[PDB]
Amino acid sequence: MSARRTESDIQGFHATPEFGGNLQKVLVDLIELSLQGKQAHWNVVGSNFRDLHLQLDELVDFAREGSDTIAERMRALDAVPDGRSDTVAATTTLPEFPAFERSTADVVDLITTRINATVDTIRRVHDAVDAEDPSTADLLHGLIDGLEKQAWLIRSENRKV
Amino acid sequence: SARRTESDIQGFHATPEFGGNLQKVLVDLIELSLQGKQAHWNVVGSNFRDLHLQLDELVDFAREGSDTIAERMRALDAVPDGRSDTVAATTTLPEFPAFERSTADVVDLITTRINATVDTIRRVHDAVDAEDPSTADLLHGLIDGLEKQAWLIRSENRKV
Amino acid sequence: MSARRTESDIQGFHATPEFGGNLQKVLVDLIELSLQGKQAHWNVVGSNFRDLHLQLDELVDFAREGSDTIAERMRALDAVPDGRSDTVAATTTLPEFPAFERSTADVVDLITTRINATVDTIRRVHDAVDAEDPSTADLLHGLIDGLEKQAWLIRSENRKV
Amino acid sequence: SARRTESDIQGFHATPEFGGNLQKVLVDLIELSLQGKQAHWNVVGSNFRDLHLQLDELVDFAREGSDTIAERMRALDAVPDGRSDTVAATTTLPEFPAFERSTADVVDLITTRINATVDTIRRVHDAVDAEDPSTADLLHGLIDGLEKQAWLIRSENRKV
Amino acid sequence: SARRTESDIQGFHATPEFGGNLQKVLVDLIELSLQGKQAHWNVVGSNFRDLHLQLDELVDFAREGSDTIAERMRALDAVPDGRSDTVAATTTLPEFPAFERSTADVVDLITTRINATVDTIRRVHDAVDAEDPSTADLLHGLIDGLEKQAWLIRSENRKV
Amino acid sequence: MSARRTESDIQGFHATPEFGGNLQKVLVDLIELSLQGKQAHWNVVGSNFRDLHLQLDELVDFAREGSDTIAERMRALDAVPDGRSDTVAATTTLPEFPAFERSTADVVDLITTRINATVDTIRRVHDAVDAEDPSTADLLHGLIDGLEKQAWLIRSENRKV
Amino acid sequence: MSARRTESDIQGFHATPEFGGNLQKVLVDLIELSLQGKQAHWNVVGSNFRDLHLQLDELVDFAREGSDTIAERMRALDAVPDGRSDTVAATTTLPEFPAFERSTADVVDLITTRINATVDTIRRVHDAVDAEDPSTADLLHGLIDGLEKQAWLIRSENRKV
Amino acid sequence: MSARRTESDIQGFHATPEFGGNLQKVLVDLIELSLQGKQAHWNVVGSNFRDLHLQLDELVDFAREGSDTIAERMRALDAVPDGRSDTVAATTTLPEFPAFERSTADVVDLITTRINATVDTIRRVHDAVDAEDPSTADLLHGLIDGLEKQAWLIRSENRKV
Amino acid sequence: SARRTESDIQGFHATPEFGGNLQKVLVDLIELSLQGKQAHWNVVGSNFRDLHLQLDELVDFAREGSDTIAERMRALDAVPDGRSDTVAATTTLPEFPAFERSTADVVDLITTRINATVDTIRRVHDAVDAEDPSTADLLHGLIDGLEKQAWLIRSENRKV
Amino acid sequence: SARRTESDIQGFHATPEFGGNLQKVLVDLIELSLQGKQAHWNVVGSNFRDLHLQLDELVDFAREGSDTIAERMRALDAVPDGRSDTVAATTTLPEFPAFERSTADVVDLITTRINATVDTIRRVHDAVDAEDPSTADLLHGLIDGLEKQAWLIRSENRKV
Amino acid sequence: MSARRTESDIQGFHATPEFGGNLQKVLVDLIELSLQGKQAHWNVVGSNFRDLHLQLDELVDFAREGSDTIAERMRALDAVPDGRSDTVAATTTLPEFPAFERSTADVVDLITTRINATVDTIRRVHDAVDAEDPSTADLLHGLIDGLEKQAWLIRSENRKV
Amino acid sequence: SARRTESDIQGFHATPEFGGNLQKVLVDLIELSLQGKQAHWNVVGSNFRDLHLQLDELVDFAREGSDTIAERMRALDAVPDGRSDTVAATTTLPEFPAFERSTADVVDLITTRINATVDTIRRVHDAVDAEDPSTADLLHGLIDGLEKQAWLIRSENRKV
Ligand SMILES: [Cl-]
Ligand SMILES: [Cl-]
Ligand SMILES: [Cl-]
Ligand SMILES: [Cl-]
Ligand SMILES: [Fe+2]
Ligand SMILES: [Fe+2]
Ligand SMILES: [Fe+2]
Ligand SMILES: [Fe+2]
Ligand SMILES: [Fe+2]
Ligand SMILES: [Fe+2]
Ligand SMILES: [Fe+2]
Ligand SMILES: [Fe+2]
Ligand SMILES: [Fe+2]
Ligand SMILES: [Fe+2]
Ligand SMILES: [Fe+2]
Ligand SMILES: [Fe+2]
Ligand SMILES: [Fe+3]
Ligand SMILES: [Fe+3]
Ligand SMILES: [Fe+3]
Ligand SMILES: [Fe+3]
Ligand SMILES: [Fe+3]
Ligand SMILES: [Fe+3]
Ligand SMILES: [Mg+2]
Ligand SMILES: [Mg+2]
Ligand SMILES: [Mg+2]
Ligand SMILES: [Mg+2]
């Protein structure tokens, strides 16, 4: 017991209310993106349907794993996520996805915009998150990298060169 | 030969009522999946881990269920709406509460909400079956799986 | 606005006593079939031993998965299964499997008869089950299909020309 | 105690009408698989790869389906005929054309071929269900799987 | 050179006493598996899920074990009897009770049932080892595996 | 310095009409074999049913993979396969598979004869194929090897002493 | 060779003695945590035994992978780890784990405390590690994230709400 | 304080020459069995060819794994195996496998006799092996168990009523 | 015995011409793999995803191809040179352009460069086969695989 | 029936001597695993990679071994102590040195320490076997596996 | 739509030309390392050939995944990679790999130097990359960690202690 | 239409000379596998582990190869002889020596044994190819695989 601490209770790192709020912002936009991605996945029609149909599911998988990561990171830091439908709809920054069947061209533009909005949220909170807890900023970097890759993989369809 | 002579052969298309009935199932499955994740993250207390894990299995089932229904709608020339505003405004599920919740409360809450989801499917079943028995089979898989989830979750709170 | 239900307690579907009894009938024949299938698997000897030995294990696997399906369906619908040895022996409708070694030809006939008996139980309760709960009848269809396939794969050894 | 005392208990035998109804399904599933491969090899043009790949998935499903139907026939002591001459002579599917075909044309042709196959299953469905509901469930799986493939393929040509 | 010149060399034959000793092990392993499933389905209450899951692991082990014993019997030209009537008539395990049972009760009941099964193996061990040490090693695997399951189950009720 | 070619358009190897026709001959016999293999797989009954039932499926798998190989080799070399039912029936060299159930012994002989016929087609076109394109002849060697192995595994049931 | 360096020997990045010492601190606490985790895994008894038994093994797996990561990172940077039992016991900051069987409730509190002590060590050295080598700080972030998740998954058992 | 041993050189368990010779006896019969098993696998023809063909390969797999186990156990205990063809032929106790094709019925009897012979060697050396090294006798028990299972699975083809 | 009496037995060694011929194949396979990755990253436009993915499959094939050839050289006592300066100075492939490129242009470009690579292999084939038929078989696998890639890629740009 | 009538049936419990003997094995397995990792990280020199890798395999074996023994103790109502202070104070293994060590030195060191570990198991074997043969089988697996590791490691330093 | 943005087009984060140039530097050295690694993998001979042969392939796998990561990160950020042979040869900082067979000892020294040159490039651009986009710096940290591990695993062969 | 009307079509029969040529390949592949194992067990010294491991990979390849050849014989109605006495009596490989051997010696010995095996395949190649080119392709796989193993093994002793 030469260097052994003798405390009965050793408490964990707790997130500030600001930090909790910042992760909550990321969470709702990740959930909204997952819901919009599925909507697009189902309703996309037209030239190169299959590629887009498939890529949109990969986007959804990533955004879902991301939302679970953020929410559980909140839990680890003694914060409380709210991923309920009403909260997501009321607080998401993503422009609304339109109803009905949409062409592959339209879906490419729509989804690129919504991914970019999501990435913007993460980029906006990044410095405040990093200042308080660099380990959480690393989770943000994974999200930024993965989502920006998805945006490139989707938007390239509409590029005329 | 017995070969048909039509250059174009069309598929079975669902009635508006049929599409509307699948839409009802869809929003309740999506809502259940969102509430399941909420519960999964925020459950605390005795037997946390079991409930945390089971809730993820519920969510997995509800998500594949929503996809199954939405794609069945698409196959039948109906158009699903799984957007957050639509889900929130049209789900029949009792609202799941915010904040940390005890294991016992989560068991009771989620059981009610699974039962609400099964009720929607059972309510639309006969109208769906009458128009398209193949879709009713998909409904049966959902009823079976969700009722299995209800049993696996609720049993925690059962006394003798 | 909101279609949300307001009850704090929504109950699940509860099977009638008759429905419970009907699934219990299926359950005991499936367990008995599993036990007889293993008996035959160990004790078969003669021409084409290996094929029958192997096929019998596939039958046992299917019947075991089936009994779990039925028993858990009972539990889901607030019915209580009884798969105990005494109950199975006292209430199964299958003819007893004979003792000791049996020839491949005899095992083929014996097991085919026992599958047919098991399927007959499922067919007998089907309409009453389907009328109360269509979703459970679908599980019965899976059992009927899978077992009648086993009966074909086993019986065909003895079918001539 | 409750043990039946007969030494031979017969299984369920399909009527010859039932056998013939499943035979109708079988030949169209086989024809669909062969046309599917023809399309898979010979498709050219804009979005070749997706179509090439999706067509193989259709063929996998149709081949599993023909196995399922033929084996169900055998289970009920009917006897399938999936020989080339029989399939050509009795399939209801319009002939697939020869030579290379554009992706747009293949989309339309294959959608029609899938729809014709589903139509056969839908046509025999009630007669099959009346004699054996367990077989009708297999038909439901086929209907669902095939109509999903029709949606996944035809969507390429959909303009909105 | 060192080649034996007899055309038929007989294998090791188990005595009928040895066969009977393995038969004792077999019926208790089968009874344990059936009681294990009964428990797995009918357990309710605090920590349901863990017990539900652990009980299935016990059943998997007991089923693999009964296969091992019955196949060892056959290898040595003994003939197993795992029929329901025989198992019910000759098992040494106390009967599992009917109906839903609390997790606490199931823990105690199943621990007792496992211990009874191990006791049978321990009782025949020396007689089995004396005739065939290779079979005794299979008994050792069973003892180790079953006592591990007893520990994993009973620990739930242990108060310290 | 640089060995780089300067053409903007380098064409691929194009098969002669004769070469295309030779691979077409192989293709139709492989498809016909696959169809007959399944027929036999469903309709075989009698002593050692299961082994033959299972082996026939392995044959069908090999023949199906083979037909895809040949058809795609045709496509690679700018030839156009025809695997349609009417063409296969009208142009296959295999004797017709008989209708209805057949005994294990008969299926063994029937299918062995049909494999032998399929291999004979491949052997007949081999030299002409090898002379134009050695790489395609190698694919033929794979087919010859794999099918003659199937013929051994199936025929040996009927071989005595 | 337009931008090619012409040095025969190009040396790697070497950790300072302070950096080596900082990683050594993390290493001993990760090893101590793995040893305490196993002790808890074996000796935990009581209500919800299985969940805790299983979670404790997941903790041990993570802490073991973590110690290997830290030690090998030391090796890469020309530092030398010491993970020997005497060194771990003499230099760990973790409060000693008690002997004998312990209740699930006690184990939850004990292990949460020990995880939190381990995380505290990583958090304490983080800034010095990051200042010298940001790539190693990223390995620390993985550890912080994974361990804090484990603490949440374990401690939640004892939460009364 | 410390129970640590102080020797810099601690030697391992070394087998007696007799022990080495006993394992060598097991080794050559296992290799011979593997070689004969393959011979039978290639050369069997007749009723139920496929089942025997397949089962013989499982026998060969088991016997090959067995020979490696024994040979490596020898190496561990400072004994030196000899698995060379000349040694195996000159010292195996198994009757020679006959040349050319053999019927399924004959292969069943022939291979069953050869397994019985292999097991008899293991049974003959068992007590002497167990007395010197119980851990090696356990490996023998695995061989006895696995081979006698193979003998059952193969011989049962020829067992009547 | 028929045992050979040589203490040392040497392996087949390739002629300088043979090694030179495999070297020619090697640099063109490496160049193709590097151009394939360039195209994979920089392709944009209609059907981007299909082409992006197919190009990775081409690269995978060319990389395993280069390894196969280089190691065959090693087996035969020849010494490969796959260094960047050597590849750049000695490849016969038309240079792949820098910057973003449309799907249609990438199809045409890569098809030409695959065909150039196949041409090298076909050009050395007879000299390789004459010296060592076993190596010609490796060449056949490369010809087959690359020509399959050419077909899968070029079909995108094919019109009716 | 042959059913036993006891409501409670107890399991086999180990003597204090037996628990003490397994404890002796446990600390030496844990010590070996810790020394194995030390060696794995700090080995340098000729054939580094082989030794680095083999040492991880040794560690894997010793860790699963320690778990096996500790859980066997638990099954038998004994209480393991695998804490660092206990391991350090009670292990019989010669101390592994600090700092980088050559491959040849690591081979010699680890071989000695494996042999020390095997010696503990062999020293307790007969007392363990006499009380509970099933546990002796677990000991045999450890002796076999560790002695295999000793051979695979030491062979590096063997001269002709 | 309470927090919903109402922009039709939301643009992504775009890398500066300096940032694009910095990632390009990393890319060419990763590709050069992969090409040199394979050259070494093929041509290494002598004492401990196999270990080095195998480790060199692991190095190549990592460097290849790394180059794909960097290039695609460039694409995501609207930069354009150039991984062509001429560009790699003209702009790599790695000392040239020698021609012909090389001893294992020489290869160890050569490859360690080339890995270290590659790591130096990443370390040199790190701060500028991190200042502009911390998410990309995290990708750099993965590369630094993985490559420095490879250098340790390779160089340790030549260490005399 | 194009259907052949004969009821029995014979397959390709190997001549007895062809059978004998494959038999030569078979015995050397078997001898190589047995010598490979001998080496694998008995190799000691510097870089033991790599050699131990590579020798097992050689044996796996040689065993798959002997199966391939024996099965090709059977496919063409030849009859293999892989019995120990036949292999010892007719193999062309120099005898592997008894006892422990250094890694350096094993490298040289095994390289020679591989080269002798390849030589047999190369010797029969043209006679085999003339009668059946499909079999010659299997010989090519063996040549390529074995010469790869020779390179991977001998490189250990190569000084440059
Ligand atoms: Cl795709
Ligand atoms: Cl089989
Ligand atoms: Cl769990
Ligand atoms: Cl290795
Ligand atoms: Fe229905
Ligand atoms: Fe269904
Ligand atoms: Fe149904
Ligand atoms: Fe060839
Ligand atoms: Fe940072
Ligand atoms: Fe990271
Ligand atoms: Fe960072
Ligand atoms: Fe033992
Ligand atoms: Fe050739
Ligand atoms: Fe080939
Ligand atoms: Fe023993
Ligand atoms: Fe054992
Ligand atoms: Fe989907
Ligand atoms: Fe279950
Ligand atoms: Fe294909
Ligand atoms: Fe081995
Ligand atoms: Fe390689
Ligand atoms: Fe454990
Ligand atoms: Mg596409
Ligand atoms: Mg058979
Ligand atoms: Mg629990
Ligand atoms: Mg080595």
Coordinates of C-alpha atoms in Angstrom, one line a residue, chain F:
Chain F
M1 CA 12.9 7.7 -69.0
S2 CA 9.4 6.5 -70.1
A3 CA 7.9 3.4 -71.7
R4 CA 4.3 4.8 -71.5
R5 CA 1.9 4.1 -74.4
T6 CA 0.3 7.1 -76.0
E7 CA -3.1 5.7 -77.3
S8 CA -6.2 7.1 -75.6
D9 CA -8.2 4.1 -76.8
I10 CA -6.8 0.6 -76.3
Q11 CA -9.3 -2.1 -77.2
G12 CA -9.8 -5.5 -75.4
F13 CA -9.5 -9.0 -76.8
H14 CA -12.6 -9.8 -78.9
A15 CA -13.7 -13.5 -79.4
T16 CA -14.4 -14.8 -82.9
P17 CA -18.0 -15.9 -83.7
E18 CA -16.7 -19.5 -83.6
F19 CA -15.3 -19.0 -80.1
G20 CA -18.5 -17.5 -78.9
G21 CA -20.5 -20.4 -80.3
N22 CA -18.2 -22.9 -78.5
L23 CA -18.7 -21.3 -75.1
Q24 CA -22.4 -21.1 -75.8
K25 CA -22.4 -24.9 -76.3
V26 CA -20.7 -25.3 -72.9
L27 CA -23.2 -22.8 -71.3
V28 CA -26.4 -24.6 -72.4
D29 CA -25.2 -28.0 -71.2
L30 CA -24.1 -26.5 -67.8
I31 CA -27.6 -24.9 -67.4
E32 CA -29.4 -28.1 -68.5
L33 CA -27.2 -30.1 -66.0
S34 CA -28.2 -27.7 -63.2
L35 CA -31.9 -28.0 -64.0
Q36 CA -31.7 -31.8 -64.3
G37 CA -29.6 -32.0 -61.1
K38 CA -32.4 -30.2 -59.2
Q39 CA -35.0 -32.5 -60.7
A40 CA -33.1 -35.5 -59.6
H41 CA -32.5 -33.9 -56.1
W42 CA -36.2 -33.5 -55.5
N43 CA -37.4 -36.7 -57.1
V44 CA -34.9 -39.4 -56.0
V45 CA -36.3 -42.1 -53.6
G46 CA -34.9 -45.3 -52.2
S47 CA -31.8 -46.8 -50.6
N48 CA -29.3 -44.1 -49.7
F49 CA -31.7 -41.3 -50.6
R50 CA -30.1 -38.7 -48.4
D51 CA -26.5 -39.0 -49.6
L52 CA -27.7 -38.6 -53.3
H53 CA -30.1 -35.8 -52.4
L54 CA -27.2 -33.9 -50.8
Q55 CA -24.5 -34.7 -53.4
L56 CA -26.9 -33.6 -56.2
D57 CA -27.1 -30.1 -54.6
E58 CA -23.3 -29.9 -54.6
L59 CA -23.4 -30.8 -58.3
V60 CA -26.1 -28.1 -59.0
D61 CA -24.0 -25.5 -57.0
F62 CA -20.9 -26.4 -59.1
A63 CA -22.8 -26.3 -62.5
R64 CA -24.5 -23.0 -61.6
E65 CA -21.1 -21.4 -60.7
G66 CA -19.8 -22.8 -63.9
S67 CA -22.5 -21.4 -66.1
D68 CA -21.9 -17.9 -64.6
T69 CA -18.2 -18.3 -65.2
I70 CA -18.7 -19.2 -68.9
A71 CA -21.4 -16.6 -69.5
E72 CA -19.3 -13.9 -67.9
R73 CA -16.1 -15.0 -69.8
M74 CA -18.3 -14.6 -73.0
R75 CA -19.2 -11.0 -71.9
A76 CA -15.6 -10.2 -71.1
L77 CA -14.6 -11.2 -74.6
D78 CA -17.5 -9.3 -76.3
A79 CA -19.6 -12.4 -76.9
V80 CA -23.3 -12.7 -75.9
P81 CA -24.6 -15.7 -74.0
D82 CA -28.1 -17.1 -74.3
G83 CA -29.3 -19.1 -71.2
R84 CA -33.0 -18.8 -71.8
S85 CA -35.2 -21.9 -71.2
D86 CA -36.3 -22.2 -74.9
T87 CA -32.7 -22.1 -76.1
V88 CA -31.4 -24.5 -73.5
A89 CA -34.2 -27.1 -74.3
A90 CA -33.7 -26.6 -78.1
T91 CA -29.9 -26.8 -78.1
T92 CA -28.7 -28.9 -75.1
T93 CA -26.9 -32.2 -76.0
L94 CA -27.9 -33.9 -72.8
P95 CA -30.4 -36.7 -72.9
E96 CA -33.7 -35.6 -71.3
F97 CA -34.1 -36.4 -67.6
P98 CA -37.1 -38.7 -67.3
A99 CA -40.3 -37.5 -65.5
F100 CA -41.5 -38.3 -61.9
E101 CA -39.7 -40.2 -59.1
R102 CA -36.7 -42.3 -59.9
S103 CA -34.8 -44.8 -57.7
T104 CA -31.4 -44.0 -56.2
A105 CA -29.8 -46.6 -58.5
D106 CA -31.4 -45.1 -61.6
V107 CA -30.6 -41.5 -60.6
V108 CA -27.0 -42.5 -60.1
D109 CA -26.7 -43.8 -63.7
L110 CA -28.9 -41.1 -65.2
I111 CA -27.0 -38.2 -63.6
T112 CA -23.6 -39.8 -64.2
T113 CA -24.5 -40.1 -67.9
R114 CA -25.6 -36.4 -67.9
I115 CA -22.3 -35.2 -66.3
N116 CA -20.3 -37.3 -68.8
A117 CA -22.3 -35.7 -71.6
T118 CA -21.6 -32.2 -70.2
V119 CA -17.9 -32.9 -69.8
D120 CA -17.8 -34.3 -73.4
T121 CA -19.1 -31.0 -74.7
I122 CA -16.3 -29.2 -72.8
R123 CA -13.7 -31.7 -74.1
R124 CA -15.0 -31.3 -77.7
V125 CA -14.6 -27.5 -77.8
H126 CA -11.4 -27.5 -75.7
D127 CA -8.7 -27.4 -78.4
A128 CA -10.4 -24.7 -80.5
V129 CA -10.9 -22.6 -77.3
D130 CA -7.3 -23.2 -76.1
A131 CA -5.9 -22.2 -79.6
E132 CA -7.7 -18.9 -79.6
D133 CA -7.5 -18.1 -75.8
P134 CA -5.4 -20.2 -73.3
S135 CA -6.9 -18.3 -70.4
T136 CA -10.4 -19.5 -71.2
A137 CA -9.2 -23.1 -71.6
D138 CA -8.0 -22.9 -68.0
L139 CA -11.6 -22.2 -66.9
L140 CA -12.6 -25.2 -69.0
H141 CA -10.0 -27.3 -67.0
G142 CA -11.7 -26.2 -63.8
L143 CA -15.1 -27.3 -65.1
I144 CA -13.7 -30.7 -66.4
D145 CA -12.0 -31.3 -63.1
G146 CA -14.9 -30.3 -60.9
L147 CA -17.6 -32.1 -62.9
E148 CA -15.5 -35.4 -63.2
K149 CA -15.1 -35.3 -59.5
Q150 CA -18.9 -35.0 -59.1
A151 CA -19.3 -37.9 -61.5
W152 CA -17.0 -40.0 -59.3
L153 CA -18.7 -39.1 -56.1
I154 CA -22.2 -39.9 -57.5
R155 CA -21.4 -43.0 -59.7
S156 CA -19.5 -44.8 -57.0
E157 CA -22.8 -45.7 -55.3
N158 CA -23.4 -48.1 -58.1
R159 CA -19.9 -49.5 -58.6
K160 CA -19.5 -53.0 -57.2
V161 CA -16.5 -54.7 -55.7

